[PDB]
Amino acid sequence: SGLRKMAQPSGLVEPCIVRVSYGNNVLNGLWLGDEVICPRHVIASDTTRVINYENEMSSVRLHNFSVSKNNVFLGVVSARYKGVNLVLKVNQVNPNTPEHKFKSIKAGESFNILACYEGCPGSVYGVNMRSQGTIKGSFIAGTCGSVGYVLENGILYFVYMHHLELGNGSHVGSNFEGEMYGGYEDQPSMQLEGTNVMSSDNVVAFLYAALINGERWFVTNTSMSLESYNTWAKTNSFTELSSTDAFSMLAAKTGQSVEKLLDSIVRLNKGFGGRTILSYGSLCDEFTPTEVIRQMYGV
């Protein structure tokens, strides 16, 4: 076919999602146990202008909050700021809480996103952590608080919650420890992202996958050592390769070694001229060896 960006399934998350409001602010909250996490800015009286939190947490009549799963409401007990995330102890443990574990995504790691609009999940798509800690999601008005999750061996991990969008378009969110990814703040301010660093690990996988679906026009006898490639890497914003390991697998199923790809990269780093790979016209790093292996002829 191609290679296409899948998402792992979502049924385990959908019940834990709710509609948290507060004033004119309607968004989505995650509901695990008697807790309900969500972007803090829901409290803020005017999100369209620099925010003074603290101040805002000082006159927040808990009775005004408004949580609901479908048209079935919930009562609020406490609420504690935790990083950029807001916590709400509700008066009704969630019967659908999924066995899980929290973590955070390192750059170049793929993960699923479940965009929601006022408590209702609307779509499911996988994404990827850019070097600067932002994602090219596809968020818009009302998807704040959407949840991002991963599964690694029957373990459902919660890793992301959506907050805001940069001036350039990139989407910013927090991990569940209350940490906004990329250190960005929850302020309608002009904040920069800084150059994006292409994930080498992930670009190699992309090329392997290409071979796999019978695509080779971009592979020629000639090769670069991790050394060499590594240099160039440091000049054209590509992560660096530590061990040609990882790909031994693919390197076998296709006989071609990384070395032969690192060269490809460099040739390809300035357009495919008129050709394409897996339908892509430029190099892509949204996939990880895991995905190529799991997606392609494999587990």
Added chain:
Amino acid sequence: SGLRKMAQPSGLVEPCIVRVSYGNNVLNGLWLGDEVICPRHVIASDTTRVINYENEMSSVRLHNFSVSKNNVFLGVVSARYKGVNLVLKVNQVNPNTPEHKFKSIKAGESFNILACYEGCPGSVYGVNMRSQGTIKGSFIAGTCGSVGYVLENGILYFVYMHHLELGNGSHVGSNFEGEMYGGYEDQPSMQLEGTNVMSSDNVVAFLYAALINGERWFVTNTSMSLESYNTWAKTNSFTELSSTDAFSMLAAKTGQSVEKLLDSIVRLNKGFGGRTILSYGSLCDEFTPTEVIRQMYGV
């Protein structure tokens, strides 16, 4: 927010998915009410040689099957052909059956896929029905029985099951009417597909997306009238575009009209000349207007 192929939640569908064996043959199945639906080739003795489904059904014996969710088995009390879909009556009603209707997908229409392996849901991704009634499902071995479905107004529609992959890589499945999309057959026989006919509506949606995602190079002050475009199309493997009416929303939001984008197509169809569009190296038609609107600035 660039443009990503998304899927709709897998929540409702995920329970419904079961594992079916008969023989050396294992796949996936769908469990609704007291019935389980799965490809009838499950029963075919040797699935690598021409099959006679009537000789096979002739030697079928219930106790020879196997149906289960998790490791909990169900008792088959009946099995039958309805076209190419094997329907199986079992001793138990799925308590998790969701309010559902059935339906058929038309060319150019998109829908969600839950690629499953031996009973377990493993991923969700959107797809698009090609002119020839096939799709580029990223289907592998062990995915047979994978279910397709859509959600409209809040009604769940089951519309696809999987069966086989053509010699050209494309993927063929069946509607729940027991009909094989494309009129293909569950025979390991050499069946061609026939040159593909792109979706003009979907391609226009695509270009609108790009414009909304801030791309313009391919923009010129040129325009091709409707009738003019359709004559070009009918001889260029693009579908007749019978109504710019579907494009009013996007048109007003970008300032560009279908006719301007029409000419863009005739031009761009001659290869992007080296550049890319929304990262693709050539034209895409796997995005309906509906998706682009809903997905971009709009509902």
